[PDB]
Amino acid sequence: QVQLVESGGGLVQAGASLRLSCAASGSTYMFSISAMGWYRQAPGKQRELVAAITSGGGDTNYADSVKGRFTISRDRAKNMVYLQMNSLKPEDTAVYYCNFAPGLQSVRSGSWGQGTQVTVSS
Amino acid sequence: EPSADWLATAAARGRVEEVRALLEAGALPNAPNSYGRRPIQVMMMGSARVAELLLLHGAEPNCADPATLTRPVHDAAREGFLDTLVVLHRAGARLDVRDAWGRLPVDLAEELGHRDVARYLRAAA
User: Fold this and answer.
1) Residues A70 and A101: beta-carbon distance below 8 Å
2) What does the record list as coiled-coil region(s) (chain B)?
3) What letter would DSSP give residue B38?
4) CB contact, 8 Å: A57 with chain B?
5) Which residues of A touch B29 (CB under 8 A)?
6) CA–CA distance, B95 with B82 (Å, rounded to integer)
């Protein structure tokens, strides 16, 4: 199985930057050949895919609401997926989750880590 | 220097051990051939093993034929190889892509009666 652990979140002011890390262990094989994404769930809202990246690391998809502010990247050798979050807005306030993103679209899964809380104050 | 043509040809022929040896010696998985076609585009779509080896070594699944705008998933779907199609989708192959004549992968599959593929693609949407 793939074990994913999420970090990098917490409290910032609007306009600030964060960098989230998803680290894979276990079937790092499965992780390396798999499209990965960063998901977020805001309070009162449905979980949404915001950024996805191919196995190769060179091809990406973003939600229009984060496009150009957030960059997804991966380190294929270190089994890591990153989200660089620039120009944070109060509406980016959410729990952020990394998971598979087949076809650079949303997975259907009951297997989620704990996520990383991102709080942006005005 | 012709390791770009050697990798594409070996992929096209479904020669797993030859692809493996070329990648291990540093043949670049995203280098195009004379028609501007990458190994992942010209590969024997019957060989899910070639596809996974290309992707393990950093091949990009979404590269389009510079004329037809056919992607690897269009050809995998048109030739009815669900195994290769799954490997490509898992790696980030977009299923919502249209070729030069506005066809989706699911269109090519349905038109030829490749029902295992068409069902996979309808469910993934």
Assistant:
1) no
2) none
3) -
4) yes
5) 56
6) 13
Q: Which residues pair with A83 in a beta bridge?
A: A20, A72
Domain residues for the domain of B19 are 3-124
Residue type, B11: A
Contacts of B42 (CB under 8 A, 6+ apart): B8, B11, B12, B33
Documented resolution in Å: 1.7
Residues of A in contact with B95 (CB under 8 A): 103, 105
Nearest CA of chain A to the CA of B48: how many Å? Answer: 13
The experimental technique behind this entry is X-ray
How many domains is chain B partitioned into structurally?
1
d(CA A89, CA A18): 12
Quick check: A54 and B92 CB within 8 A? Answer: yes
Domains and CATH numbers, chain A: 2-105+116-121 (2.60.40.10)
Q: Compute how many other C-beta atoms are within 10 angstroms of the C-beta atom of residue A86.
A: 14
| Rounded distance between C-alpha atoms, residue B80 and residue B74, angstroms | 10
Where does A27-59 show beta strands of DSSP type E?
36-41, 48-53
How many residues in chain A? Answer: 122
- Supply B15's token pair: 């020669």
Closest residue in B to A53 (Cα–Cα):
B92
Q: What is the CATH number of the domain that holds B12?
A: 1.25.40.20
